[PDB]
Design a protein around this ligand. Structure first.
Ligand SMILES: Nc1nc2c(ncn2[C@@H]2O[C@H](COP(=O)(O)OP(=O)(O)OP(=O)(O)O)[C@@H](O)[C@H]2O)c(=O)[nH]1
Ligand SMILES: Nc1nc2c(ncn2[C@@H]2O[C@H](COP(=O)(O)OP(=O)(O)O)[C@@H](O)[C@H]2O)c(=O)[nH]1
Ligand SMILES: COc1ccc(/N=N/c2cc(OC)c(OC)c(OC)c2)cc1O
Ligand SMILES: [Ca+2]
Ligand SMILES: [Mg+2]
Lengths: 424, 155, 437
């Protein structure tokens, strides 16, 4: 089908969301003012998926911006494409959430959630046939994690037949030395297992490791990390925005990629890796299955692919991709499950990103993602066993039993992943 | 009973109140219902100056709560580097073991406070120390693929 | 003259349908606007081509056909294509949201939103007929619309048109060009629910057609466009007997009489020869004996299987072009001893022969060379059981773990329908075994 409504919530959600819109606007010939300056009609066929058409032939992003911290509003406005979002679509509270999931989910964030829903309804009713939602956020803070999961749940209550898709940035001690973030992410994962159809797991442990160890950036910044994110989000949404041959939408993605309802957490991957200032088809198909090119800090060779999608971008032989994908699928045979036949899908798109002649984007549903959940589970449990700072949460009305249940659900998820790794 | 007030003052970083209570006979080694001392809470919540005044007034730097946690355990878990160093300078047992078999080194590694890991190694933390699951600090770094930690632990 | 209505369901059915009707037009001398200078009877007629084309009175010849798809993208290409003026607008029907590769969405939820509109539009076409004989239904096995909506449609047509024949052209999935991982599920589900309702079904194995484009036509990477022009040549050869004078397969009932000895084993095999690249324009022409031999080579089959394994129950050979009946008899006489061809003991070993003395048409822009003679063989051989077995194996692998089943249960289907459909395929495979394979 067609239209997607995008919500970005909290600091990380808004910072990576803003870069997403700068990146695809340049790909679609949209300028900071909104006017179309492209030289190819292929940029306009499916522009309706992400942009509404305004009077005077100007395209406004189907984008909703929410935070409990008003300071985020001014920052997005002060960006280059900051004067393109609908001012009516800015929804900002008074006091933030102070990295407190419970303030996002139960108190401060709950008070604002009706106002966000009003603009979601307005943006939804003006869609010909809305296919679903996307949400950008971090799991480690208070607003994106706490208020984001609340907003997801109320949306899924009111739009139970539409697809809910998230880009969810997982915390790393290497990037944020804030010890309550295992709490916030675990409590959110509990909700995400139940209330999203498909979740892209973007891991700041991966992004930092990529910049530092591979890109030689001695001191990575959020700008450096989000350059990686922006390339990934552009890649995974390529089929949604250009014609190609995959009549692309989010629900077909879910049907083909998610064999079991809870195992809907994707490991993305990108090639080539590049910095913010600085290839053959066989080199791409090899990098795409390399652990160092994943955006989730785990080893695909420690598990088994259930389902995989690739998107090649640029000018290349359809046969050369088909042949190389065949090759990679033969040498790595013991890393694909054998009870889902034909479980690797290739897409090709003529239009490459900016500054690249050819790129590849990987989307994998792999049992190896349990290593990310195991990592967060260990850190959650270390803090939880000493009950460190638990009163910051219970003081907002949370019951302590909500921690053990989130912890039990995450260990159940790691187990479910292991079962289908073992299966034959 | 001034012990309950010292406990709250130490948690909330109220330096003035801590001094006043100690001068009026407050039990520096009072415990809450779980066995935490004022030193436990000052180390937990990062109040360096309160840690230092408590240690000049008879705090047991190696007190344990009912779970076996020392102040050094909690400082290493939460990541309060300057307090870790003060605790070691005043006699903390670098290899104290809690009821999960965790040492401070285990906790600092798990939480990724790499500066604290280096500090503890340089004071004799036991790299062979196993938790109740058999895991050493090095085991954690391998099962998590934390290459920075594993490098640190090889010195 | 008795009328046939064609129904094209989903992307595969619509795109192949567009290819077939173009070729039909070229065969009969109908222009893209519906004008037919050769029809001396204006506004009416009882000629053989009227089984497929009605007439308006201003001289327009209009396909007896309806296109349907649950989203608009593919039918919009017919509305704006070269033959846009050919079809009535009201016989091109679209929803706004597809079945998402999910049989249950096409059958139970989304498909129920459009089924009554589709039945009413079909009724209008049927009301124009004076002796409707039945329906030719084109669809994929793999799509949510092609599988799920087609079985819903087939159920309703059996209630509203109990006495009429229903034939299928069905696209069987192949890994090379497939779209979804759950296509084995959709294939078995629709097969199960359509079986009682379909009298004869011609399966087109996308792998077989792909391999023919690569081998015979030298197309390194065939696309849908190449596959569909080839498939349309074969569909035309099957339906030519319905559209022209002849003495074999002259109405829908005779298809069944000739090719379906028992109702459930109603899946005949089509073979076609010669397929020659349009770059070989001056090629030496092949004799009747040569092209007839070629029909017993597995590589020329529209479904991948090995007929030398199984056993024949029926065999019709339909010739087009410069074909002398005595030369066919001599060809058949040879291909009864020098090849491993075994009929079932309870069936006559007779081959049925029909000849149309006009050579086949090629579409401009196509991949095929003009030929002076060509042949399509339709057979019912137990060897087609191999196609079902390869399908059932893939199904079984995923269903044992219940992979993807929740997407179907979430769309109003009960999980017991999975087991009952697979049990039906087990019975169908055994049906072929008893006869002999
Ligand atoms: N031969 C041929 N096969 C096609 C064509 N289009 C799609 N297919 C095949 O049909 C199957 C996919 O089903 P579709 O017909 O695309 O699905 P649909 O009926 O439109 O149903 P939805 O799920 O609602 O999109 C795959 O096996 C494709 O390879 C075509 O034009 N020609
Ligand atoms: N990769 C990346 N991570 C971010 C960014 N901004 C914040 N984070 C991470 O997000 C987490 C903190 O959440 P944040 O979005 O700042 O809190 P919120 O404003 O309450 O939603 C920490 O893990 C940060 O490292 C960003 O621009 N890029
Ligand atoms: C296991 O086999 C498979 C795996 C993935 C498959 N489809 N992948 C996509 C489909 C998309 O929309 C149709 C899409 O557009 C949103 C997309 O962009 C990321 C990928 C198909 C399969 O048969
Ligand atoms: Ca006439
Ligand atoms: Mg379709």
């Amino acid at each position: 089908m067609r239209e997607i409504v995008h919500i970005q919530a909290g600091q990380c959600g808004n910072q990576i969301g803003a870069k997403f819109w700068e990146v695809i606007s340049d790909e679609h010939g949209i300028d900071p003012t909104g006017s179309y300056h492209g030289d190819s009609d292929l940029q306009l066929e499916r522009i309706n998926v992400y942009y509404n058409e305004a009077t005077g032939n100007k395209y406004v992003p189907r984008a909703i911006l929410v935070d409990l911290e008003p300071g985020t509003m001014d920052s997005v406005r002060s960006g280059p494409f900051g004067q393109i979002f609908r001012p009516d679509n800015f929804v900002f509270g008074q006091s933030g959430a102070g990295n407190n999931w419970a303030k996002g989910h139960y108190t401060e964030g709950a008070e604002l959630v009706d106002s966000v829903l009003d603009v979601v309804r307005k943006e939804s009713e003006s869609c010909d046939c809305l296919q679903g939602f996307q949400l950008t956020h971090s799991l480690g803070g208070g607003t994106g994690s706490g208020m984001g999961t609340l907003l997801i749940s109320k949306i899924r209550e009111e739009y139970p037949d539409r697809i809910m898709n998230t880009f969810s940035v997982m915390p790393s001690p290497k990037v944020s030395d804030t010890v309550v973030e295992p709490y916030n992410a675990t409590l959110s994962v509990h909700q995400l297992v139940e209330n999203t159809d498909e979740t892209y797991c973007i891991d700041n442990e991966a992004l930092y490791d990529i910049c530092f160890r591979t890109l030689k950036l001695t001191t990575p910044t959020y700008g450096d990390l989000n350059h990686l994110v922006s390339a990934t989000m552009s890649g995974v949404t390529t089929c949604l925005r250009f014609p190609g041959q995959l009549n692309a939408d989010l629900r077909k993605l879910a049907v083909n990629m998610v064999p079991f309802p809870r195992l809907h957490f994707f490991m993305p991957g990108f090639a080539p890796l590049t910095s913010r200032g600085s290839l053959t088809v066989p080199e791409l198909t090899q990098q795409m299955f390399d652990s160092k090119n994943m955006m989730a800090a785990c080893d695909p060779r420690h598990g088994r692919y259930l389902t995989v999608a690739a998107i090649f971008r640029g000018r290349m032989s359809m046969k050369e991709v088909d042949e190389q994908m065949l090759n990679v699928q033969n040498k790595n045979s013991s890393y694909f499950v054998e009870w889902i036949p034909n479980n690797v899908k290739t897409a090709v798109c003529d239009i490459p990103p900016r500054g690249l002649k050819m790129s590849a984007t990987f989307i994998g549903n792999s049992t190896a993602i349990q290593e990310l959940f195991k990592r967060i589970s260990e850190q959650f449990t270390a803090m939880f066993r000493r009950k460190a700072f638990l009163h910051w949460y219970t003081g907002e009305g949370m019951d302590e039993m909500e921690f053990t249940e989130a912890e039990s659900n995450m260990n159940d998820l790691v187990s479910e992943y292991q079962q289908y790794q073992d299966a034959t | 009973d001034l012990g309950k007030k010292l406990l709250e003052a130490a948690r909330a970083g109220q330096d003035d109140e801590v001094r006043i209570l100690m001068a009026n006979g407050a039990d520096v080694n009072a415990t809450d219902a779980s066995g935490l001392t004022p030193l436990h809470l000052a180390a937990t919540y990062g109040h360096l100056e309160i840690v230092e005044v408590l240690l000049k007034h008879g705090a047991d730097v190696n007190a344990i709560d009912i779970m076996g946690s020392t102040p050094l355990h909690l400082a290493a878990l939460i990541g309060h580097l300057e307090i870790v160093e003060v605790l070691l300078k005043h006699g903390a047992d670098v290899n104290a073991v809690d009821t999960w078999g965790d040492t401070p080194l285990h906790l600092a590694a798990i939480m990724g406070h790499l500066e604290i890991v280096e500090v503890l190694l340089k004071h004799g933390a036991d790299v062979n120390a196993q938790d109740k699951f058999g895991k050493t600090a090095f085991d954690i770094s391998i099962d998590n693929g934390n290459e920075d930690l594993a490098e640190i632990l090889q010195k | 003259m008795r009328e046939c209505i064609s129904i094209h369901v989903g992307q595969a059915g619509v795109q192949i349908g567009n290819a077939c009707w173009e070729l039909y037009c070229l065969e009969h001398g109908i222009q893209p606007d519906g004008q037919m200078p050769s029809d001396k009877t204006i506004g009416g007629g009882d000629d053989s081509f009227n089984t497929f084309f009605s007439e308006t009175g201003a001289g327009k010849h209009v396909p007896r056909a309806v296109f349907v798809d649950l989203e608009p993208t593919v039918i919009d290409e017919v509305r704006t294509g070269t033959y846009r003026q050919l079809f009535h607008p009201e016989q091109l029907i679209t929803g706004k949201e597809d079945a998402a590769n999910n049989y249950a969405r096409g059958h139970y939820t989304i498909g129920k939103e459009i089924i009554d509109l589709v039945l009413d539009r079909i009724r209008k076409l049927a009301d124009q007929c004076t002796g409707l004989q039945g329906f030719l239904v084109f669809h994929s096995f793999g799509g949510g619309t092609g599988s799920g909506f087609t079985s819903l449609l087939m159920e309703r047509l059996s209630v509203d048109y109990g006495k009429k024949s229903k034939l299928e052209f069905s696209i069987y999935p192949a890994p090379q060009v497939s779209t979804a991982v759950v296509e084995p599920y959709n294939s078995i589900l629709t097969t199960h629910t359509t079986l009682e309702h379909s009298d004869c079904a011609f399966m087109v194995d996308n792998e077989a057609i792909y391999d023919i484009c690569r081998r015979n036509l030298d197309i390194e990477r065939p696309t849908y466009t190449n596959l569909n022009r080839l498939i349309s040549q074969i569909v035309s050869s099957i339906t030519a007997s319905l559209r022209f004078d002849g003495a074999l397969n002259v109405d829908l009932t005779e298809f069944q009489t000739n090719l379906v000895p028992y109702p459930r084993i109603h899946f005949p095999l089509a073979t076609y020869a010669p397929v020659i690249s349009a770059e070989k324009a001056y090629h030496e022409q092949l004799s009747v004996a040569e092209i007839t031999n070629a029909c017993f080579e597995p590589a020329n089959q529209m479904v991948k299987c090995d007929p030398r394994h199984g056993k024949y129950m029926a065999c019709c050979l339909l010739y087009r072009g410069d074909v002398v009946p005595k030369d066919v008899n001599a060809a058949i006489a040879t291909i009864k001893t020098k090849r491993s061809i075994q009929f079932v003991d309870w069936c006559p070993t007779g081959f049925k022969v029909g000849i149309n003395y006009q050579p086949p048409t090629v579409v401009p822009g196509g991949d095929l060379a003009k030929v002076q003679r060509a042949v399509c063989m339709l057979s019912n051989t137990t060897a087609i059981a191999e196609a079902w077995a390869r399908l059932d194996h893939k199904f079984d692998l995923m269903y044992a773990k219940r992979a993807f089943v929740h997407w179907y249960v979430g769309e109003g289907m009960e999980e017991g329908e999975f087991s009952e459909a697979r049990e039906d395929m087990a019975a169908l495979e055994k049906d072929y075994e008893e006869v002999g394979v």
